[PDB]
Amino acid sequence: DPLLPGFDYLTLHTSAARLRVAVKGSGPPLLLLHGYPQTHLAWHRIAPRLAEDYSVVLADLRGYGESRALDGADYSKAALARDQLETMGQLGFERFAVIGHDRGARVGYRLALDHPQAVAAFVSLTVVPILDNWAAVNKVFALNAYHWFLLAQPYDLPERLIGADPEHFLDYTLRRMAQGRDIYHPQALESYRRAFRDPAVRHAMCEDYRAAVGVDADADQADRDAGRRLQCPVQVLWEERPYAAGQHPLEIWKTWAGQVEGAAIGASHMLPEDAPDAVLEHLLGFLASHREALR
Amino acid sequence: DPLLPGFDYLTLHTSAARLRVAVKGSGPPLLLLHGYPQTHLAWHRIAPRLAEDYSVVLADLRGYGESRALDGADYSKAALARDQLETMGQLGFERFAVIGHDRGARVGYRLALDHPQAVAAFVSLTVVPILDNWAAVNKVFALNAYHWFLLAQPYDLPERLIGADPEHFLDYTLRRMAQGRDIYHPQALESYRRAFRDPAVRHAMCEDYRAAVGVDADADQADRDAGRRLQCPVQVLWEERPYAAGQHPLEIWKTWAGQVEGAAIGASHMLPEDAPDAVLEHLLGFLASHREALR
Known part of the structure; x- marks a missing residue:
């Protein structure tokens, strides 16, 4: 069966980037943002069903997939959030819903915090804000999430290590993330x-992970300091696994937003590809219940 | 000037290993154990002065330098501590002092805990027990010490990454550890x-880091559970830098041993090569004050 039947593949030119987007559908707009180490194709099992009822926009994040910075470029979440405002603006949307997975959910919440008039609704798949992740670091988190600390090392250490046999590291990572399941x-x-295999992409991924340690975490701290919260309905869909005290995703989001719902999904971290029907059921229910927000 | 003038280079055959040792001197025995990513040559600025007054034994740790396991082998601290008992035994010593740096100080304290009748005195350069290191893990520790979490990843992930351009990773690491100083x-x-550059050595280093996460940490926990402490005089020489609450090396050692002294040294982590005269002054003073222990 076909990946993304009827999606129109575009290149958009913004001030700081050349961005790959794919679009389909009619009605209220939804922007869907993939994570690491993937691309917009990660949404192939979800996006077509959504395009039956909504305007659907899929992008590659700056530096990932076929999207690229024009330059020394900024790969911080704020910068990639600006890319999203400009992309949706060009396509004709000043206000829209945002559904993110992994790094894209990080671009998502930054965008909703910086530009609350632009974000109608926000869905996070598997993500809480980086400020909360950093406070939870301990031995087992650093082992499970070792790459968060390798990829943030100064330029060009991690680029040299991952660039040696790229496809092998990519495949290993993908298998690990999927808990060995044949979902790709x-x-x-x-x-x-x-x-x-593109060194530019690997560099952009490292820059993302560096920004997570630094500027992204600073931005989240400044929001918590200001008591600034997301102003739209929020849904969080999380991987069914144990969560320590204070680390439950629903409880964490409730500290960032006044209107929060969510559900556990019995699949791996790679929810879009591993549990698309479960996710779709919750997405569709959430967007339906908040159709007034989308107006 | 010559490295290790008058040291006799030996190979010793134990039950589980073929070990490179270098020896010189006369009088009470001292075993000196290097760290990562080095060899026994790391002691070249200290060992000759010590051999003027002591029997001096330098070894390469199993898997590092020219030492190798006969096999699937065990690279746990307990196993390498057994290597040390056997090495000193063969050379004619049933009881001896132990001076370790970095991983060798980890072999050292395990040996002193498991075989208190064999260890007359113990010096740690830059090290506290791994149980204490794991309890202190937070965001900045995992960034500074990223390799602790990369090298512990399942076989063969880290071997593939570090094995790509070995010498480049080696040199980078060495420069980082020395804070950019020309000490090598x-x-x-x-x-x-x-x-x-030897894949066997890189594999043995990864196995060390795996053992640190697992069996080594279990061993330390079981000792703390049993209230078992080192029975000999202890000296800790530490890198002059800020230490968080409960993380001061002197305070930590005092929870592992009844007889503890120490001092801050104003140099990098690589104390044997960066501050040999400072270290020697403290070592010589400590061994002199405890000459009754050495009997």
């Missing part, structure tokens, strides 16, 4: 592979 | 380089 469509896999 | 004698450097 063979054609989407070659797309994830060719991006990771 | 050009001939000792080629020795550290040729070991790291």
